[PDB]
mmCIF file of C-alpha atoms in Angstrom:
data_model
loop_
_atom_site.group_PDB
_atom_site.id
_atom_site.type_symbol
_atom_site.label_atom_id
_atom_site.label_comp_id
_atom_site.label_asym_id
_atom_site.label_seq_id
_atom_site.Cartn_x
_atom_site.Cartn_y
_atom_site.Cartn_z
ATOM 1 C CA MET A 1 -12.245 17.978 -29.133
ATOM 2 C CA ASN A 2 -9.188 19.015 -27.375
ATOM 3 C CA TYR A 3 -6.547 17.366 -29.174
ATOM 4 C CA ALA A 4 -3.494 18.676 -27.071
ATOM 5 C CA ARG A 5 -4.486 16.379 -24.327
ATOM 6 C CA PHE A 6 -3.501 13.616 -26.715
ATOM 7 C CA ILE A 7 -0.171 14.764 -28.071
ATOM 8 C CA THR A 8 3.238 14.863 -25.897
ATOM 9 C CA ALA A 9 5.431 18.080 -25.338
ATOM 10 C CA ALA A 10 8.199 16.439 -27.566
ATOM 11 C CA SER A 11 5.401 15.735 -30.413
ATOM 12 C CA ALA A 12 3.812 19.122 -29.887
ATOM 13 C CA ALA A 13 7.216 20.621 -30.244
ATOM 14 C CA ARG A 14 7.956 19.543 -33.933
ATOM 15 C CA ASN A 15 7.866 22.035 -36.535
ATOM 16 C CA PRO A 16 7.780 21.500 -40.389
ATOM 17 C CA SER A 17 10.813 20.273 -42.156
ATOM 18 C CA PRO A 18 12.668 19.999 -45.297
ATOM 19 C CA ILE A 19 12.192 20.086 -49.356
ATOM 20 C CA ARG A 20 9.890 22.886 -48.445
ATOM 21 C CA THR A 21 9.471 26.364 -50.388
ATOM 22 C CA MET A 22 11.143 25.191 -53.275
ATOM 23 C CA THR A 23 8.899 23.089 -55.218
ATOM 24 C CA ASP A 24 5.718 24.996 -54.290
ATOM 25 C CA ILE A 25 6.280 28.593 -55.086
ATOM 26 C CA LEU A 26 7.537 26.895 -58.355
ATOM 27 C CA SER A 27 4.686 24.753 -58.713
ATOM 28 C CA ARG A 28 2.590 27.843 -59.280
ATOM 29 C CA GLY A 29 4.473 30.589 -60.484
ATOM 30 C CA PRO A 30 5.395 31.292 -64.250
ATOM 31 C CA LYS A 31 7.668 28.839 -66.325
ATOM 32 C CA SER A 32 10.286 31.157 -66.679
ATOM 33 C CA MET A 33 11.385 31.434 -62.841
ATOM 34 C CA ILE A 34 14.724 30.062 -62.075
ATOM 35 C CA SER A 35 15.258 28.654 -58.966
ATOM 36 C CA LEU A 36 18.629 27.649 -57.122
ATOM 37 C CA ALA A 37 16.666 27.536 -53.687
ATOM 38 C CA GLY A 38 15.812 23.518 -53.977
ATOM 39 C CA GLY A 39 17.569 20.471 -52.158
ATOM 40 C CA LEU A 40 16.989 18.160 -54.750
ATOM 41 C CA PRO A 41 19.875 15.950 -56.500
ATOM 42 C CA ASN A 42 20.146 15.849 -60.299
ATOM 43 C CA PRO A 43 17.936 12.603 -61.379
ATOM 44 C CA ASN A 44 19.698 12.533 -64.585
ATOM 45 C CA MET A 45 22.560 10.811 -62.632
ATOM 46 C CA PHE A 46 20.566 8.001 -61.503
ATOM 47 C CA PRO A 47 21.279 4.564 -63.232
ATOM 48 C CA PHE A 48 17.762 3.262 -63.563
ATOM 49 C CA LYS A 49 16.221 4.521 -66.864
ATOM 50 C CA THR A 50 12.600 2.861 -67.649
ATOM 51 C CA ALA A 51 10.568 0.253 -65.967
ATOM 52 C CA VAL A 52 7.953 -2.661 -67.181
ATOM 53 C CA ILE A 53 5.694 -4.460 -64.776
ATOM 54 C CA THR A 54 3.446 -7.072 -65.821
ATOM 55 C CA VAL A 55 0.121 -7.038 -63.754
ATOM 56 C CA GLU A 56 -2.115 -10.098 -63.343
ATOM 57 C CA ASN A 57 -5.887 -8.879 -64.159
ATOM 58 C CA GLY A 58 -4.469 -5.523 -65.403
ATOM 59 C CA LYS A 59 -2.825 -3.317 -67.782
ATOM 60 C CA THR A 60 0.875 -3.643 -67.693
ATOM 61 C CA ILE A 61 2.816 -0.543 -65.668
ATOM 62 C CA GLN A 62 5.095 1.511 -67.861
ATOM 63 C CA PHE A 63 7.581 3.744 -66.034
ATOM 64 C CA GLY A 64 9.123 6.089 -69.412
ATOM 65 C CA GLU A 65 12.042 7.994 -69.158
ATOM 66 C CA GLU A 66 10.483 11.144 -67.417
ATOM 67 C CA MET A 67 8.244 9.228 -64.948
ATOM 68 C CA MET A 68 11.156 6.980 -64.038
ATOM 69 C CA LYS A 69 12.948 10.032 -63.050
ATOM 70 C CA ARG A 70 9.953 11.079 -60.693
ATOM 71 C CA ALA A 71 9.727 7.877 -59.126
ATOM 72 C CA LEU A 72 13.615 8.015 -58.461
ATOM 73 C CA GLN A 73 13.584 11.473 -56.888
ATOM 74 C CA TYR A 74 12.124 12.729 -53.398
ATOM 75 C CA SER A 75 8.489 13.050 -53.189
ATOM 76 C CA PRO A 76 6.158 14.624 -50.464
ATOM 77 C CA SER A 77 6.022 13.426 -46.816
ATOM 78 C CA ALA A 78 2.239 12.511 -46.599
ATOM 79 C CA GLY A 79 2.541 10.672 -50.131
ATOM 80 C CA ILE A 80 1.966 11.513 -54.006
ATOM 81 C CA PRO A 81 -0.930 13.528 -54.733
ATOM 82 C CA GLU A 82 -2.599 11.350 -56.842
ATOM 83 C CA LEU A 83 -2.372 8.453 -54.543
ATOM 84 C CA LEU A 84 -3.769 10.366 -51.433
ATOM 85 C CA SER A 85 -6.695 11.425 -53.792
ATOM 86 C CA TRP A 86 -7.539 7.982 -55.021
ATOM 87 C CA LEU A 87 -7.161 6.755 -51.244
ATOM 88 C CA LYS A 88 -9.366 9.536 -49.941
ATOM 89 C CA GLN A 89 -12.351 8.599 -52.318
ATOM 90 C CA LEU A 90 -12.006 5.065 -51.411
ATOM 91 C CA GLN A 91 -12.114 5.881 -47.606
ATOM 92 C CA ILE A 92 -15.374 8.117 -48.373
ATOM 93 C CA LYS A 93 -16.877 5.012 -50.359
ATOM 94 C CA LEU A 94 -16.201 2.462 -47.925
ATOM 95 C CA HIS A 95 -16.754 4.567 -44.732
ATOM 96 C CA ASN A 96 -18.159 7.766 -45.299
ATOM 97 C CA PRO A 97 -16.453 9.289 -42.426
ATOM 98 C CA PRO A 98 -18.614 12.334 -40.949
ATOM 99 C CA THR A 99 -15.508 14.334 -40.372
ATOM 100 C CA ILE A 100 -14.914 14.811 -44.170
ATOM 101 C CA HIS A 101 -15.860 18.571 -44.153
ATOM 102 C CA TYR A 102 -15.044 19.433 -40.361
ATOM 103 C CA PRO A 103 -12.812 22.622 -39.561
ATOM 104 C CA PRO A 104 -9.292 21.396 -39.246
ATOM 105 C CA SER A 105 -8.830 21.908 -35.733
ATOM 106 C CA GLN A 106 -12.127 19.921 -34.719
ATOM 107 C CA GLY A 107 -11.004 16.846 -36.646
ATOM 108 C CA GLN A 108 -11.291 17.315 -40.454
ATOM 109 C CA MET A 109 -10.335 13.847 -42.140
ATOM 110 C CA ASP A 110 -6.782 13.874 -43.307
ATOM 111 C CA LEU A 111 -4.540 11.025 -44.855
ATOM 112 C CA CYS A 112 -0.988 10.145 -44.554
ATOM 113 C CA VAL A 113 0.756 7.445 -46.656
ATOM 114 C CA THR A 114 3.097 5.499 -44.392
ATOM 115 C CA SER A 115 5.983 3.137 -45.122
ATOM 116 C CA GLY A 116 3.712 0.228 -44.266
ATOM 117 C CA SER A 117 0.784 0.500 -41.695
ATOM 118 C CA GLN A 118 2.978 -0.235 -38.580
ATOM 119 C CA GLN A 119 5.347 2.848 -39.278
ATOM 120 C CA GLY A 120 1.861 4.946 -38.615
ATOM 121 C CA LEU A 121 0.821 3.152 -35.794
ATOM 122 C CA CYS A 122 4.436 3.592 -33.989
ATOM 123 C CA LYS A 123 4.491 7.209 -34.445
ATOM 124 C CA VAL A 124 0.985 7.388 -33.327
ATOM 125 C CA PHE A 125 1.974 5.654 -29.851
ATOM 126 C CA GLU A 126 5.065 7.900 -29.718
ATOM 127 C CA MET A 127 2.945 10.915 -30.300
ATOM 128 C CA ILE A 128 0.459 10.336 -27.498
ATOM 129 C CA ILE A 129 2.201 8.221 -25.014
ATOM 130 C CA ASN A 130 4.055 9.482 -21.795
ATOM 131 C CA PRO A 131 5.581 7.023 -19.119
ATOM 132 C CA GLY A 132 2.755 6.175 -16.662
ATOM 133 C CA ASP A 133 -0.060 6.986 -19.088
ATOM 134 C CA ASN A 134 -2.898 4.510 -18.693
ATOM 135 C CA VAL A 135 -4.055 2.577 -22.531
ATOM 136 C CA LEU A 136 -6.589 0.112 -22.978
ATOM 137 C CA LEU A 137 -6.316 -2.997 -25.262
ATOM 138 C CA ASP A 138 -7.601 -6.870 -25.561
ATOM 139 C CA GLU A 139 -5.291 -9.602 -25.029
ATOM 140 C CA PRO A 140 -4.183 -11.856 -26.831
ATOM 141 C CA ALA A 141 -2.653 -8.906 -29.275
ATOM 142 C CA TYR A 142 -0.352 -8.701 -32.012
ATOM 143 C CA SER A 143 3.081 -9.501 -30.664
ATOM 144 C CA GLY A 144 4.630 -6.517 -32.568
ATOM 145 C CA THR A 145 2.209 -4.078 -31.145
ATOM 146 C CA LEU A 146 3.177 -5.276 -27.451
ATOM 147 C CA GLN A 147 6.670 -5.050 -28.382
ATOM 148 C CA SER A 148 6.115 -1.265 -29.444
ATOM 149 C CA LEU A 149 4.342 -0.369 -26.375
ATOM 150 C CA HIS A 150 6.668 -2.000 -23.942
ATOM 151 C CA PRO A 151 9.382 0.758 -24.024
ATOM 152 C CA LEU A 152 6.950 3.310 -24.107
ATOM 153 C CA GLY A 153 6.505 2.821 -20.273
ATOM 154 C CA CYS A 154 2.572 2.917 -20.182
ATOM 155 C CA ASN A 155 0.281 0.861 -18.186
ATOM 156 C CA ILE A 156 -1.568 -1.842 -20.534
ATOM 157 C CA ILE A 157 -5.082 -2.647 -19.275
ATOM 158 C CA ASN A 158 -6.459 -5.657 -20.351
ATOM 159 C CA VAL A 159 -10.000 -5.618 -21.640
ATOM 160 C CA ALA A 160 -11.895 -8.794 -21.875
ATOM 161 C CA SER A 161 -12.635 -10.320 -25.233
ATOM 162 C CA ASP A 162 -14.764 -13.326 -26.135
ATOM 163 C CA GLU A 163 -15.389 -14.565 -29.983
ATOM 164 C CA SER A 164 -17.021 -11.345 -30.974
ATOM 165 C CA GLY A 165 -14.129 -9.172 -29.848
ATOM 166 C CA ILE A 166 -13.862 -6.592 -27.137
ATOM 167 C CA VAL A 167 -16.714 -7.034 -24.755
ATOM 168 C CA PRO A 168 -18.344 -3.697 -23.767
ATOM 169 C CA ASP A 169 -19.294 -4.853 -20.269
ATOM 170 C CA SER A 170 -15.694 -5.371 -19.467
ATOM 171 C CA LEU A 171 -14.349 -2.081 -20.852
ATOM 172 C CA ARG A 172 -17.477 -0.184 -19.000
ATOM 173 C CA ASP A 173 -16.349 -1.895 -15.675
ATOM 174 C CA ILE A 174 -12.834 -0.645 -16.330
ATOM 175 C CA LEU A 175 -13.812 2.561 -16.958
ATOM 176 C CA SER A 176 -15.864 2.809 -13.800
ATOM 177 C CA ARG A 177 -12.360 3.153 -11.995
ATOM 178 C CA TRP A 178 -12.762 6.986 -13.042
ATOM 179 C CA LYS A 179 -15.426 9.708 -13.371
ATOM 180 C CA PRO A 180 -15.975 11.271 -16.933
ATOM 181 C CA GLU A 181 -14.856 14.483 -15.745
ATOM 182 C CA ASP A 182 -11.701 13.060 -14.546
ATOM 183 C CA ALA A 183 -10.666 13.142 -18.594
ATOM 184 C CA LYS A 184 -9.889 16.903 -17.954
ATOM 185 C CA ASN A 185 -7.912 16.379 -15.152
ATOM 186 C CA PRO A 186 -4.863 14.712 -16.113
ATOM 187 C CA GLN A 187 -3.548 13.980 -12.160
ATOM 188 C CA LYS A 188 -5.191 10.619 -12.167
ATOM 189 C CA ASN A 189 -4.435 9.667 -15.512
ATOM 190 C CA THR A 190 -7.571 8.455 -17.555
ATOM 191 C CA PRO A 191 -6.974 6.213 -20.647
ATOM 192 C CA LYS A 192 -5.278 7.981 -23.651
ATOM 193 C CA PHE A 193 -6.874 5.585 -26.135
ATOM 194 C CA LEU A 194 -7.835 2.103 -26.623
ATOM 195 C CA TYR A 195 -6.247 -0.072 -29.314
ATOM 196 C CA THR A 196 -8.038 -2.796 -31.019
ATOM 197 C CA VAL A 197 -7.737 -5.054 -34.384
ATOM 198 C CA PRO A 198 -11.689 -5.075 -35.187
ATOM 199 C CA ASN A 199 -11.463 -7.684 -37.786
ATOM 200 C CA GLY A 200 -9.583 -10.889 -37.905
ATOM 201 C CA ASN A 201 -7.512 -10.283 -34.854
ATOM 202 C CA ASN A 202 -4.073 -11.807 -34.796
ATOM 203 C CA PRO A 203 -3.871 -14.429 -33.350
ATOM 204 C CA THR A 204 -7.655 -15.049 -32.552
ATOM 205 C CA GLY A 205 -9.494 -14.375 -35.803
ATOM 206 C CA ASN A 206 -12.171 -12.793 -33.945
ATOM 207 C CA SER A 207 -14.113 -9.631 -35.170
ATOM 208 C CA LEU A 208 -16.078 -7.095 -33.596
ATOM 209 C CA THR A 209 -19.807 -6.868 -34.115
ATOM 210 C CA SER A 210 -21.511 -3.558 -35.140
ATOM 211 C CA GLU A 211 -23.657 -3.436 -31.843
ATOM 212 C CA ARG A 212 -20.237 -3.584 -29.602
ATOM 213 C CA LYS A 213 -18.677 -1.121 -31.899
ATOM 214 C CA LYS A 214 -21.367 1.603 -31.076
ATOM 215 C CA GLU A 215 -21.273 0.625 -27.361
ATOM 216 C CA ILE A 216 -17.434 1.194 -27.326
ATOM 217 C CA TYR A 217 -17.843 4.414 -29.339
ATOM 218 C CA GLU A 218 -20.087 5.668 -26.787
ATOM 219 C CA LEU A 219 -17.563 5.080 -23.940
ATOM 220 C CA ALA A 220 -14.972 6.572 -25.792
ATOM 221 C CA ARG A 221 -16.770 9.957 -25.964
ATOM 222 C CA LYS A 222 -18.206 9.425 -22.614
ATOM 223 C CA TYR A 223 -14.353 9.402 -20.787
ATOM 224 C CA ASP A 224 -12.999 11.263 -23.762
ATOM 225 C CA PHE A 225 -10.173 8.631 -25.203
ATOM 226 C CA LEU A 226 -9.225 8.011 -28.801
ATOM 227 C CA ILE A 227 -9.802 4.859 -30.516
ATOM 228 C CA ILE A 228 -6.960 3.548 -32.694
ATOM 229 C CA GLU A 229 -8.451 1.035 -35.242
ATOM 230 C CA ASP A 230 -5.883 -0.850 -36.515
ATOM 231 C CA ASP A 231 -7.463 -2.653 -39.303
ATOM 232 C CA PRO A 232 -5.015 -4.786 -41.572
ATOM 233 C CA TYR A 233 -7.337 -7.505 -42.402
ATOM 234 C CA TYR A 234 -10.333 -5.177 -43.195
ATOM 235 C CA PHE A 235 -10.218 -6.621 -46.975
ATOM 236 C CA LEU A 236 -9.917 -10.200 -45.668
ATOM 237 C CA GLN A 237 -13.453 -10.423 -44.197
ATOM 238 C CA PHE A 238 -14.833 -13.772 -45.070
ATOM 239 C CA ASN A 239 -18.483 -12.213 -44.398
ATOM 240 C CA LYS A 240 -20.380 -10.945 -47.524
ATOM 241 C CA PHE A 241 -21.116 -7.538 -46.003
ATOM 242 C CA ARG A 242 -18.407 -5.767 -43.844
ATOM 243 C CA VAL A 243 -19.178 -4.418 -40.450
ATOM 244 C CA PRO A 244 -19.067 -0.752 -40.267
ATOM 245 C CA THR A 245 -15.898 0.674 -38.904
ATOM 246 C CA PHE A 246 -15.226 2.972 -36.217
ATOM 247 C CA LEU A 247 -13.941 5.728 -38.727
ATOM 248 C CA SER A 248 -17.777 5.478 -40.198
ATOM 249 C CA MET A 249 -19.589 6.287 -36.806
ATOM 250 C CA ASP A 250 -16.532 8.862 -35.954
ATOM 251 C CA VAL A 251 -18.762 11.899 -35.413
ATOM 252 C CA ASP A 252 -16.383 13.187 -32.690
ATOM 253 C CA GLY A 253 -13.098 13.113 -34.573
ATOM 254 C CA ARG A 254 -11.524 10.873 -32.359
ATOM 255 C CA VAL A 255 -10.672 7.868 -34.589
ATOM 256 C CA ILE A 256 -7.323 7.051 -35.780
ATOM 257 C CA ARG A 257 -7.315 4.195 -38.477
ATOM 258 C CA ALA A 258 -4.538 2.208 -39.999
ATOM 259 C CA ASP A 259 -5.161 0.438 -43.159
ATOM 260 C CA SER A 260 -2.832 -1.794 -44.534
ATOM 261 C CA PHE A 261 -2.109 -3.102 -48.244
ATOM 262 C CA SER A 262 0.233 -5.702 -46.940
ATOM 263 C CA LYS A 263 -1.962 -8.607 -47.157
ATOM 264 C CA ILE A 264 -3.774 -7.865 -50.380
ATOM 265 C CA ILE A 265 -1.559 -5.936 -52.832
ATOM 266 C CA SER A 266 2.224 -6.205 -51.134
ATOM 267 C CA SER A 267 3.904 -6.565 -47.967
ATOM 268 C CA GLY A 268 7.476 -5.993 -49.200
ATOM 269 C CA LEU A 269 6.649 -2.659 -50.951
ATOM 270 C CA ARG A 270 6.170 -1.116 -47.758
ATOM 271 C CA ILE A 271 2.966 1.060 -48.369
ATOM 272 C CA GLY A 272 0.137 1.609 -45.783
ATOM 273 C CA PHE A 273 -1.610 4.676 -44.653
ATOM 274 C CA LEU A 274 -3.357 6.479 -41.769
ATOM 275 C CA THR A 275 -6.461 8.284 -41.804
ATOM 276 C CA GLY A 276 -7.449 10.460 -38.787
ATOM 277 C CA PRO A 277 -8.163 13.991 -37.334
ATOM 278 C CA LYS A 278 -5.764 16.573 -39.298
ATOM 279 C CA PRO A 279 -4.391 17.825 -35.841
ATOM 280 C CA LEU A 280 -3.129 14.214 -35.191
ATOM 281 C CA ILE A 281 -2.176 13.320 -38.632
ATOM 282 C CA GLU A 282 -0.055 16.628 -38.916
ATOM 283 C CA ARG A 283 2.109 15.286 -35.681
ATOM 284 C CA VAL A 284 2.644 12.058 -37.548
ATOM 285 C CA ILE A 285 3.822 13.837 -40.573
ATOM 286 C CA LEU A 286 6.027 16.160 -38.925
ATOM 287 C CA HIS A 287 7.512 12.892 -37.236
ATOM 288 C CA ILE A 288 7.860 11.532 -40.731
ATOM 289 C CA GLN A 289 9.557 14.491 -41.922
ATOM 290 C CA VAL A 290 12.614 13.748 -39.940
ATOM 291 C CA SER A 291 12.736 10.196 -40.288
ATOM 292 C CA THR A 292 11.830 8.225 -43.620
ATOM 293 C CA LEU A 293 11.145 11.610 -45.126
ATOM 294 C CA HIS A 294 8.333 9.710 -47.224
ATOM 295 C CA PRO A 295 7.369 6.305 -48.667
ATOM 296 C CA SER A 296 9.132 5.132 -51.677
ATOM 297 C CA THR A 297 8.003 7.106 -54.709
ATOM 298 C CA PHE A 298 8.712 4.044 -57.051
ATOM 299 C CA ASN A 299 6.403 2.045 -54.927
ATOM 300 C CA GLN A 300 3.776 4.650 -54.694
ATOM 301 C CA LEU A 301 3.823 5.270 -58.163
ATOM 302 C CA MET A 302 3.300 1.368 -58.826
ATOM 303 C CA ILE A 303 0.196 1.166 -56.765
ATOM 304 C CA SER A 304 -1.214 4.268 -57.869
ATOM 305 C CA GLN A 305 -0.942 3.409 -61.529
ATOM 306 C CA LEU A 306 -2.271 -0.213 -60.631
ATOM 307 C CA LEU A 307 -5.416 1.189 -58.394
ATOM 308 C CA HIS A 308 -6.289 4.223 -61.241
ATOM 309 C CA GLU A 309 -6.366 1.615 -63.871
ATOM 310 C CA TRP A 310 -8.502 -0.702 -61.684
ATOM 311 C CA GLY A 311 -10.608 1.724 -60.431
ATOM 312 C CA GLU A 312 -12.833 1.141 -57.440
ATOM 313 C CA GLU A 313 -14.264 -1.909 -59.152
ATOM 314 C CA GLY A 314 -11.103 -3.394 -60.165
ATOM 315 C CA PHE A 315 -9.875 -3.138 -56.671
ATOM 316 C CA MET A 316 -12.868 -4.547 -54.874
ATOM 317 C CA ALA A 317 -12.702 -7.736 -57.432
ATOM 318 C CA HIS A 318 -9.319 -8.059 -56.696
ATOM 319 C CA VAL A 319 -10.059 -8.153 -52.772
ATOM 320 C CA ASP A 320 -12.706 -10.644 -53.449
ATOM 321 C CA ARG A 321 -10.349 -12.880 -55.155
ATOM 322 C CA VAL A 322 -8.111 -12.760 -52.187
ATOM 323 C CA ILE A 323 -11.015 -13.393 -49.706
ATOM 324 C CA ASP A 324 -12.156 -16.488 -51.811
ATOM 325 C CA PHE A 325 -8.730 -17.917 -51.597
ATOM 326 C CA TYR A 326 -8.404 -17.404 -47.957
ATOM 327 C CA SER A 327 -11.543 -18.405 -47.249
ATOM 328 C CA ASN A 328 -10.869 -21.685 -49.044
ATOM 329 C CA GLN A 329 -7.719 -22.328 -46.988
ATOM 330 C CA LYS A 330 -9.780 -21.289 -44.027
ATOM 331 C CA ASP A 331 -12.238 -24.136 -44.880
ATOM 332 C CA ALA A 332 -9.549 -26.393 -45.514
ATOM 333 C CA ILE A 333 -7.852 -25.980 -42.205
ATOM 334 C CA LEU A 334 -11.189 -26.353 -40.192
ATOM 335 C CA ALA A 335 -11.793 -29.545 -42.100
ATOM 336 C CA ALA A 336 -8.448 -30.728 -41.227
ATOM 337 C CA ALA A 337 -9.009 -29.561 -37.379
ATOM 338 C CA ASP A 338 -12.502 -31.373 -37.520
ATOM 339 C CA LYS A 339 -10.884 -34.349 -38.867
ATOM 340 C CA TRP A 340 -7.681 -34.796 -36.322
ATOM 341 C CA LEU A 341 -8.541 -32.403 -33.334
ATOM 342 C CA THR A 342 -10.816 -35.060 -31.787
ATOM 343 C CA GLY A 343 -11.968 -33.294 -28.617
ATOM 344 C CA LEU A 344 -8.350 -32.973 -28.183
ATOM 345 C CA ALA A 345 -8.500 -28.953 -28.483
ATOM 346 C CA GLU A 346 -11.217 -26.179 -29.222
ATOM 347 C CA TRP A 347 -11.219 -23.340 -31.817
ATOM 348 C CA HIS A 348 -13.454 -20.591 -33.029
ATOM 349 C CA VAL A 349 -14.120 -20.391 -36.578
ATOM 350 C CA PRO A 350 -11.888 -17.144 -38.084
ATOM 351 C CA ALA A 351 -14.256 -14.470 -39.165
ATOM 352 C CA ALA A 352 -11.484 -12.797 -41.063
ATOM 353 C CA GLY A 353 -7.579 -13.122 -41.776
ATOM 354 C CA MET A 354 -5.271 -15.911 -42.069
ATOM 355 C CA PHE A 355 -4.938 -17.528 -38.567
ATOM 356 C CA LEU A 356 -6.624 -20.097 -36.545
ATOM 357 C CA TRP A 357 -6.540 -20.206 -32.846
ATOM 358 C CA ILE A 358 -6.361 -23.335 -30.967
ATOM 359 C CA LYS A 359 -6.833 -24.317 -27.485
ATOM 360 C CA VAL A 360 -5.255 -27.845 -26.354
ATOM 361 C CA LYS A 361 -6.982 -29.356 -23.627
ATOM 362 C CA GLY A 362 -5.660 -30.859 -20.667
ATOM 363 C CA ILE A 363 -2.198 -29.013 -21.299
ATOM 364 C CA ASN A 364 -1.194 -26.099 -19.274
ATOM 365 C CA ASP A 365 1.682 -24.681 -21.554
ATOM 366 C CA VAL A 366 2.339 -25.959 -25.248
ATOM 367 C CA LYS A 367 5.677 -24.164 -26.186
ATOM 368 C CA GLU A 368 7.365 -27.293 -24.709
ATOM 369 C CA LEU A 369 4.882 -29.555 -26.619
ATOM 370 C CA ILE A 370 5.747 -27.632 -29.702
ATOM 371 C CA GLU A 371 9.357 -26.343 -29.611
ATOM 372 C CA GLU A 372 10.628 -29.662 -28.301
ATOM 373 C CA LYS A 373 8.368 -32.606 -29.475
ATOM 374 C CA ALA A 374 6.686 -31.021 -32.669
ATOM 375 C CA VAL A 375 10.043 -29.928 -34.355
ATOM 376 C CA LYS A 376 11.486 -33.368 -34.507
ATOM 377 C CA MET A 377 8.159 -34.886 -35.836
ATOM 378 C CA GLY A 378 8.401 -32.002 -38.750
ATOM 379 C CA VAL A 379 5.598 -29.880 -37.744
ATOM 380 C CA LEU A 380 5.584 -26.066 -36.429
ATOM 381 C CA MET A 381 3.086 -23.669 -34.969
ATOM 382 C CA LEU A 382 3.447 -21.025 -32.572
ATOM 383 C CA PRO A 383 2.704 -21.152 -29.050
ATOM 384 C CA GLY A 384 0.541 -18.373 -27.915
ATOM 385 C CA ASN A 385 2.793 -17.085 -25.096
ATOM 386 C CA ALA A 386 3.985 -14.282 -27.429
ATOM 387 C CA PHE A 387 0.831 -12.375 -27.924
ATOM 388 C CA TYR A 388 0.136 -11.511 -24.134
ATOM 389 C CA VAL A 389 1.722 -8.541 -22.120
ATOM 390 C CA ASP A 390 3.178 -11.402 -20.077
ATOM 391 C CA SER A 391 4.747 -13.448 -22.342
ATOM 392 C CA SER A 392 6.212 -15.877 -19.524
ATOM 393 C CA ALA A 393 2.942 -17.030 -18.310
ATOM 394 C CA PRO A 394 1.700 -20.604 -19.626
ATOM 395 C CA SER A 395 -0.142 -20.739 -22.536
ATOM 396 C CA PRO A 396 -2.449 -23.876 -23.962
ATOM 397 C CA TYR A 397 -3.178 -21.890 -27.147
ATOM 398 C CA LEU A 398 -1.327 -22.223 -30.710
ATOM 399 C CA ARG A 399 -1.663 -19.997 -33.669
ATOM 400 C CA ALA A 400 -1.954 -21.759 -36.903
ATOM 401 C CA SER A 401 -1.604 -20.098 -40.319
ATOM 402 C CA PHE A 402 -3.612 -20.856 -43.536
ATOM 403 C CA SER A 403 -2.161 -18.587 -45.706
ATOM 404 C CA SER A 404 -0.003 -21.017 -47.736
ATOM 405 C CA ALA A 405 -0.457 -24.703 -46.364
ATOM 406 C CA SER A 406 -1.880 -27.336 -48.923
ATOM 407 C CA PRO A 407 -4.723 -29.175 -47.642
ATOM 408 C CA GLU A 408 -2.242 -32.370 -47.461
ATOM 409 C CA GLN A 409 0.175 -30.524 -45.373
ATOM 410 C CA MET A 410 -2.587 -29.430 -43.158
ATOM 411 C CA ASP A 411 -3.884 -32.847 -42.598
ATOM 412 C CA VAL A 412 -0.358 -34.107 -41.856
ATOM 413 C CA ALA A 413 0.291 -31.273 -39.626
ATOM 414 C CA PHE A 414 -2.666 -31.927 -37.347
ATOM 415 C CA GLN A 415 -1.906 -35.577 -37.723
ATOM 416 C CA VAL A 416 1.243 -35.179 -35.979
ATOM 417 C CA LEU A 417 -0.206 -32.391 -33.376
ATOM 418 C CA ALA A 418 -3.170 -34.698 -32.396
ATOM 419 C CA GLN A 419 -0.529 -37.700 -31.864
ATOM 420 C CA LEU A 420 1.735 -35.519 -29.564
ATOM 421 C CA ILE A 421 -1.238 -34.365 -27.511
ATOM 422 C CA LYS A 422 -2.748 -37.561 -26.929
ATOM 423 C CA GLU A 423 0.772 -39.083 -25.832
ATOM 424 C CA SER A 424 1.325 -35.713 -23.582
ATOM 425 C CA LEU A 425 -1.803 -36.347 -21.844
#
């Protein structure tokens, strides 16, 4: 409602940047207009001329001469228009955000294609955080998010979490340190935002429930902080019905959502997108304008043509094939764990994503059990230390990936792990 509270002085100071009044006064004027004002290099010099890309369960994608010249040239900072338009309709279909027709100044929904979802997240953190600011999140958390927040000098306040994600009662108790009106008084530093991964948290695999999301949103309104919904496993949920998102209930315009195609379409193409209130999305776009400039035009056109041929039906059919694969992988790793973890460890069933979070019994720290003993036995799993702000503290947890391993490999790996646990007790 007052977005200036969430924008640093540096971010607010940004002004719009190049490739400007050249391809817009010419994108509506007469076809007889001569322009020597643009800053585009001549694309006829570029060496790639055509492309043919085959697609499984889809029409082959072809870039002819003219399309290739577009794919190899600069494009708009927020993304190419046909991809932005498709993605906007997808967000309306999946989330029907309340903010679609709000005035810009009070949070009109806006989208930005980013060079991966983490780029959007990083620029959002940089947009908001002054040194000393307080921010809320639940540990264990994605190590990359922790490493992104560390140099910004914010105080990370841990919110309790269990098998159903963030525990609202813990958030409420933490927030009771302040009065709601303190949010309009920056002297004692009410939290600027809550960050969470609401589906298939990396590393835990746990997901938030609908009732808790509603409680959390009410707290975000009461103490007027933003919700940063980092949802890269949104399309990798094993439940038949997806839990409503924070975006879908965001009547205030206080949610910034990051979506990713890295798990379902491609991680290497570096294409994700942000959805959020226009004043905040605009600050991110302005930062992109002086940084990457835009996501690869070529990769955007690959994805946009794929998605347009698929339609929303073909897209959802693809996600359902991917869910089917990962859910079978999940069943397989759970079977191996049931077989070989013998009351030697505890674990919750992942609700989404690609990781199993294992607590080993009777051992206080497992990085020595793995990085020393397990490595020479030919098995590797990741100690949980890296997913806490204080990574030097001992952790009895391991993160095991089921994205790729065959059932045989899982059986072997957990046999080895079981032996090591038993001979280490």
